Symmetry: C5
Subunit: 336 residues, 5 copies
């Protein structure tokens, strides 16, 4: 009852060459690709890379594997994977991709009577996801995933997604778990590119990422906000207390300076200003401006004390209002 | 006396195909899995990963390997492991799993007369353990371990634990040694999942982790507690000592700010507030509030000195009581 | 219709030795090399290394592979790559080069009737790019890429670029994306080197890198510039305020000291002064000089107060002018 | 003269099965293990791991390899290593072990006429060495090294050290070079463990490590000791100098706080107090106590100045004596 | 014309055993080793390791490979490398050595009529170079490179350098490029070592390294030198300015303390004092001594003001002279 299967496998491999694609010189091989995301790994920001584990699956028609028998399907494993022809799919943006070999090489091969072949592989891709951090941290990132044939041009092998976008890409409920991102959705697309070696079809899958705020608020914004409030306390101290008010201005300014350096340590070394950078710069101006006001007041406190008192009293009201007004514009501008 | 064993091995391999599972088209293959944990490696927090070394073992029945001879068992090694059929078990949450090949590939194969097969493999799994750090550091983590067949659906290969939970999973006495965790216990479970490729049984093992406190107390809590006490010292200084009391308020506030940044450097970049974060925030309020009290007292020390003295004297008693009362509620709330 | 291809492949491999180069003892093998840069990876500064992913391609003539058939080309994959002779090309500056094996080893083999062979391979090279950081960050780097045969001297195998430089090297539009560099252009060259094992031709490709400024301005220059301005504020304070002006001088000097240490943390540990280092040193002099002026003024404020006031008033004007004048010379000198 | 050796090798491999241990079903295989330590790699503290390179050697008797010829020994290399049976030795505590393959796989095989076999392998073991840092840095660590058979129980394969302990383990003169440890000596032992798969003999080698002090003295103790002395300087300042003495107390307390955090950055995140931690805590009390004394003195300097002067004068003598006395007890307690 | 070469190769491999060294039982195999350094990689200080890329070459005589033909040499590649016998050379100090496999395994095999064989291999060695940092950074390091046979004792295989030292080791002009070292020269040597497995010849190559100063001057010495000068500024301030002079003493002392910790972060954790450590300690004494002088002066400024003024005036001259004198002795002592 089991010996029948062995004979069928031997017959298919008899006279079968794995170096030639099915339907060579008679038609164009068609491949259907479906992807299942086991887990969307962490999205490293500094290196512009993200790790993803998927069960990449490919389906194609091969008449050379047609067979007749009591069983309509032939489940198998990696043993027969190398004995037949398979597409030379590769990932363009994958900087370093490795497979899983334990406990057994994670590969499956299913063959039907008509000759249809299903081949699925488990992969871990450390792809590169360039990001435009103009609105960081209020930025949305669209990490793509490009793959295609390495040796067969568009005239020989063509990749097409199966059914709609929802069925083409599937993400596990627990797979989409990122500490500082939200997986809003996924999309797919196809395109052709002309090269010196010929035209090759490109299959691209895009993941919509919505960065979640809250870590930077507790890390960068709140220390800056409290620091600005600390500087304004000097406005409530007497002018003659030159030493006391000096500490607030000097300490606050230096505190903001180190926060900017510390804040960008995790941020990628991008050569442009981000939204957070402007917020820090504005906060730096307030603390720096407060010190200038104290110096100006202390400079004229002897010649015209009357105006000095008025400026100090006014500063107690103007500064808090401007800082509060700026926050509403800043948060509203990006949070909308 | 030794040549008899060689003939038996040759006979079993004669006409045996490793590409077909035992009992194909006649029944459903049943596999019994037992696990022994050599050492529960460190549980990295930042990357949500933990390393575990186990002696994964699988048992199944194969009638094709039945034999008769003086010896009731056939101890072997990895040499014959690849010559026969083995399940394509894999770990779903294993981000990167590698085997041990030195001195020899750590694999054993034992066969009995009835045809029962025992196959054990040594593995090192860098699995992912998502954690909800809402009660951190007073949090309990349940790291799972999911594995199953890659090519054989539930209708062909089924995994079941052997005997009770205690025998299914065994942990070495010295294996469970973590610097900041306690291995309270282990549990196992089984479930079915429906996918496009069919239904596959899932075997999950859960490890109960109870984080041990003491490192964060010496690292985060104690510096914060002493810092708050330092600020309250200013209440015992004369009001006219404006400069002296200014240093305490400014220095203490900045000290708390850097502690919050330093504390979360090791903590994962989670976008929500933890229990420790609230404690730091409350401590920040006390030191910040003390500075406000000094500023308010110094503002009215000229118009109504009588009330200024009363506020300063009262602050010496109210502040220590509130800080002490808060600790009892905080520690009692989580330590219970 | 497909069986014809199988016979052709068998005939070519019949009597073909892959250990002997084509045209041995009759002529000199000629190889044409064309490169396509999929993505120019990050250029690490500390380790003097850069990562590049390219589709390295080689073309050569082999009369032993001549064939006649209906199809003028024979697209193939890695299966036949090892069955024939290929050049032993290697990268001299490549510290650690690894290939991509997923989903399939990225290799293509195309053969024409005349016997011309096209062989392309995907590689990731962690080459070393020594840099002379004399004008850093206003420095231009020319990272080379040297490769050649390992066993065949110039008298047997010769590498030559195909057509012009533009066609020889091609860079993808999205491939050239660096956080702190601009890919101005590419150039190629050839040379011979004499060694104990014979003369070997060297193929070198140079990439022109123009570092983009803006990250260091927000990281190093701006904190230094503001720090210098902070020190000059002390010139507007009264001389008798010894304590108040002391804080500015001491704090500013220490702030510059830590910036220099922090600035070079990312910079490679080079044993020479860079352009940025001189800017920091000059800024350090201004803040340090301001403290000296205060000390000198405070030393003679009792004997000859008249001159002390004049020096303090003059310092308020001289110092800002010199710092501003220095910036124009510094920026103009390098930004030109 | 050389052809004789070839015939002998062919004869031994004729009818020899490498899947069966020598003396199967007739006796118990005995293996003698001798180890040579090429270099005891660094002992990482944070990860509780140490790297060691050894020339692991195993000797056993195999009657199937008996031969007669002019030469009494048959030096060989890795080529014949896989053609015969070898023990499946593995390291229990080895988290990740890799071999050396350059220039050639470092393996030797020597066979004598009687059939004795010598098999040595070079290995690099990243074993785990749990440490109890109760007396750190005055702590002695005993890193073990456990290995044994993976498939052959104690009833089939037994490991025994050769001759005495000195000959069993040999360490190169230059191999034992650690930056913060001393290799006092080595010891060996054997034991049996009962498991579900049977009883397996365990071979354990223990290395005696005596941590060398001097790095922490220049890194942690000395900064703390000088900081405490700095605080005591305030006792020599006038009481009315409230601001001057405030800086010493505040700055010293914060300096100790950062030292404790910095000190434990390299130390493993252990959830218990070490000997160094107590020393830091005691030093923190002295600096903190000095600030309290100043605050208490300044609080009563108006009502009863007479007692205030006495306390300040007494503090100048009591504090240095207590700090010096504590050091003698602390150093003597552990350095003995 | 090409078929002649194929026959010659087949004849040599006919009856040739790669498991037996040439001239076995008739003489002692002699191997000549020549090394070419493609690039001397970075010399990591913390891990006591350095990376080097070399074209290791070995030459030996094999009569079994004698042939007669029109061509006097047989250039080849890695294909035939494994088909013949090669020495089992290995590196003793190599902690982790890996080869280069792209584009092709970098191996060459050349055979002459007399039977001489040339075999060269490209290797990347992460060898260990212990360093005695007693005179750091004015220290000279001699990193060795030990290699030899793994299975053939001195009585069978002997390694000898070819010609003089200059020809034995060759370093590329651009290869010797280190950020903090100078490759003064190279030397070679041979020695015998007796072991339990027999006597094995050892080939050692030593590289003379002269650390280049300038990075530490801008990183450690200059901040310390300026800090000491900053402390001496307090000597020019009035005694009554207790608060002003307190800041200089406290801030400078703490600044030196953090520099010592920061300086040794890159330095290896060696348990002994280096030359730089003494310089920092001396600088610490000057700043600390200045604070003591101020405290002593302020203590007696009321009882005997006359002596207090003299001490302060004298300190302005003595301190700068001693610091300058110390530098001349320190720099001259090591820079000579
Ligand atoms: C142009 C690079 C290249 C080369 C080569 O070496 O060219 C010099 N050889 C074969 C190739 N197959 C490709 C398939 C592709 O799309 C799926 C593709 O898209 C980026 C590029 C190539 C490709
Ligand atoms: C759905 C992913 C998948 C695919 C594939 O490529 O689907 C597009 N192929 C074969 C597969 N065998 C599985 C067994 C499983 O459980 C043990 C399992 O659970 C997560 C998933 C798969 C699986
Ligand atoms: C001199 C190093 C060397 C050796 C060797 O071991 O020499 C002792 N053997 C074979 C070699 N083929 C080379 C080809 C080259 O250029 C493409 C080359 O350029 C740096 C060097 C070598 C080379
Ligand atoms: C109990 C783990 C185990 C298993 C397995 O999978 O058990 C479920 N299989 C085969 C085994 N051979 C061993 C030899 C040993 O000592 C040298 C040993 O000691 C820790 C354990 C095993 C072992
Ligand atoms: C003593 C270690 C050893 C062993 C072994 O396992 O001994 C227990 N076996 C074979 C060996 N061949 C060696 C060649 C050497 O020099 C080139 C050498 O020098 C350090 C050591 C060995 C060596
Ligand atoms: C790519 O080429 C194929 C050729 O059949 C064509 O059908 C398809 O529309 C092309 N795709 C695009 C995006 O142009
Ligand atoms: C999974 O499927 C099998 C089919 O035999 C069934 O016996 C078992 O109860 C199912 N498990 C669950 C959790 O539903
Ligand atoms: C290298 O050698 C070849 C020998 O044919 C010669 O044609 C070529 O001009 C040489 N190249 C250089 C740069 O000298
Ligand atoms: C282990 O078992 C063997 C069985 O022969 C016995 O000889 C030996 O004494 C046992 N060792 C220990 C430590 O019990
Ligand atoms: C090593 O042994 C050989 C044996 O022939 C001898 O010639 C050589 O001088 C010895 N080398 C040393 C350094 O003793």
């Amino acid at each position: 009852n089991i010996t029948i299967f062995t004979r069928i496998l031997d017959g298919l491999l008899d006279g079968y060459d794995n170096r030639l694609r099915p339907g060579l010189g008679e038609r164009i091989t068609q491949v259907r690709t479906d992807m299942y995301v086991n887990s969307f790994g962490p999205v490293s920001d500094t290196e512009m890379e993200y790790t993803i584990d998927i069960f990449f699956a490919q389906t194609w028609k091969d008449e050379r594997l047609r067979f007749k028998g009591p069983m309509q399907r032939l489940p198998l494993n990696n043993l027969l994977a190398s004995k037949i022809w398979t597409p030379d799919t590769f990932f363009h943006n994958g900087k370093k991709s490795f497979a899983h070999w334990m406990t057994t090489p994670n590969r499956m091969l299913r063959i039907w009577n008509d000759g249809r072949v299903l081949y699925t592989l488990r992969l871990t891709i450390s792809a590169e996801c360039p990001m435009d951090l103009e609105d960081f941290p209020m930025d949305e990132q669209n990490c793509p995933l490009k793959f295609g044939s390495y040796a067969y041009p568009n005239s020989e092998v063509v990749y097409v997604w199966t059914n709609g976008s929802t069925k083409s890409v599937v993400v596990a409920e627990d797979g989409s778990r990122l500490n500082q991102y939200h997986l809003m959705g996924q999309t797919v697309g196809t395109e052709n590119i002309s090269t010196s070696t010929g035209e090759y079809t490109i299959m691209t899958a895009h993941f919509h990422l919505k960065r979640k705020i809250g870590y930077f608020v507790i890390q960068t914004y709140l220390p800056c906000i409290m620091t600005v409030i600390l500087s304004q306390v000097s406005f409530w101290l007497n002018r003659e207390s030159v030493a006391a008010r000096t500490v607030f201005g000097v300490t606050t300014v230096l505190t903001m300076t180190t926060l900017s350096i510390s804040a960008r340590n995790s941020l990628p070394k991008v050569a442009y200003a981000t939204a957070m950078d402007w917020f820090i710069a504005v906060c730096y101006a307030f603390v720096f401006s407060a010190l200038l006001e104290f110096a100006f007041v202390n400079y004229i406190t002897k010649s015209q004390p009357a105006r000095a008192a008025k400026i100090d009293k006014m500063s107690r009201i103007v500064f808090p209002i401007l800082f509060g007004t700026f926050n509403l514009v800043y948060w509203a501008t990006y949070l909308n």
